[PDB]
Amino acid sequence: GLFDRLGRVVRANLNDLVSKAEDPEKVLEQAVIDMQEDLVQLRQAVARTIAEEKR
Amino acid sequence: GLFDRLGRVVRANLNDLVSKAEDPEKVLEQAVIDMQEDLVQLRQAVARTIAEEKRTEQRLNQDTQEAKKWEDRAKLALTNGEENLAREALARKKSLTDTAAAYQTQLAQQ
Amino acid sequence: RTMSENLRRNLAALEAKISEAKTKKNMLQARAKAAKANAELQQTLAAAAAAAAAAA
């Protein structure tokens, strides 16, 4: 609908301004910290597949 | 009707004023954000067509292995001299091979 | 006893065509659910992708 598209534009303009406010270098190392915990989530699930295989 | 056209003009004048109020550069990147989530909606539906394609292929493997089972029951009936039960098993086999050809046709389309 | 052989075959032939109709029902309903989803997804995505890009 038209008002959904207009609504997402006013919300996106405010969200983009907040995305400009943080330093891309700091956000890039936060993204590497986040990506390291993402590998932490994957190893727990993968290890549990080994436990399920053994079961 | 005339009052529908006049009604949409008073409503459109207010809506156009609101469309002037937002910056076209900000609305253009909001439109790119919106368009990126539109691709997110398409990939979920497309991936589910792959799952549905694989489900008809599973039914094809189920009905074809059921046809092999009935063929083994027909073989058993023939060694036991019960030819009437062999024909009964062959009738089950035929409906499974005929529906398997329908699932092959569905899978070809998918 | 000749009638009961005939009835026992007719009873087995009836459940055989009931059984056939039930497997057919599941496959026909599946195709109808799939076709509903294909139409909505294809039309919705194609319309939204053309419309938002052109306006921006």
Numbering used by the authors:
A (entry chain A): 2 to 56
B (entry chain A): 2 to 111
C (entry chain A): 112 to 167
Quote the authors verbatim.
Moreover, by replacing the hinge 2 region of Vipp1 with ten alanines, we generated plasticity-restrained Vipp1 assemblies. The resulting variant Vipp1 dL10Ala indeed showed reduced structural plasticity when reconstituted with membranes, as it mostly formed type II tubes (69%), including single rings (27%) and stacked rings (3%), and type I tubes (2%). Therefore, we conclude that the mutated hinge 2 region is a critical element for the structural plasticity of Vipp1 assemblies. While we could reconstruct most of the structures formed by Vipp1 dL10 at low resolution, we could solve the structure of a subclass of type II tubes at 3.0-Å resolution, presumably because of the reduced flexibility. Outside of the different diameters and helical symmetries, the structures of both type II tubes were similar to the wild-type (WT) type II tubes with the monomers arranged approximately 45° to the tube axis. However, the dL10Ala monomer models had an overall extended length and showed less flexibility in the hinge 2 region, especially in single-ring monomers, which also explains the observed larger diameters of dL10Ala rings, as smaller rings require stronger bended and less extended monomers. The type II tubes have one continuous approximately 170-Å-long α-helix formed by α2, α3 and α4 presumably stabilized by the introduced deca-alanine stretch. The monomer structure of the type IIb tubes revealed another unique feature of this assembly, namely the fractured structure helix α5 that is split into two separate helices while still maintaining the canonical ESCRT-III α1−α3 hairpin-to-α5 contacts. The 3.0-Å-resolution structure of a plasticity-restrained Vipp1 dL10Ala mutant revealed the amphipathic positioning of helix α0 with the hydrophobic face directed into the tube lumen to potentially interact with hydrophobic acyl chains while the positive helix face interacts with the inner Vipp1 ring or tube surface and may be capable of interacting with lipid head groups. Our 3.0-Å Vipp1 tube structure now reveals that D5, R6, R9, R12 and E23 of α0 interact with three different subunits through α4 (R170), α4 (K174) and α1 (D35) to hold these helices in place, thereby aligning the interacting subunits and helices in an orientation favoring rings and type I and II tubes over the PspA-like assembly, in addition to described lipid interaction properties.
A prominent member of the PspA family is the vesicle-inducing protein in plastids 1 (Vipp1), also known as IM30 (inner membrane-associated protein of 30 kDa). Vesicle-inducing protein in plastids 1 (Vipp1) is critical for thylakoid membrane biogenesis and maintenance. Vipp1 appears to have two functions: in membrane maintenance (that is, during heat or light stress) and in thylakoid membrane (TM) biogenesis and/or remodeling. Vipp1 binds to negatively charged membranes and membrane binding depends on stored curvature elastic stress.
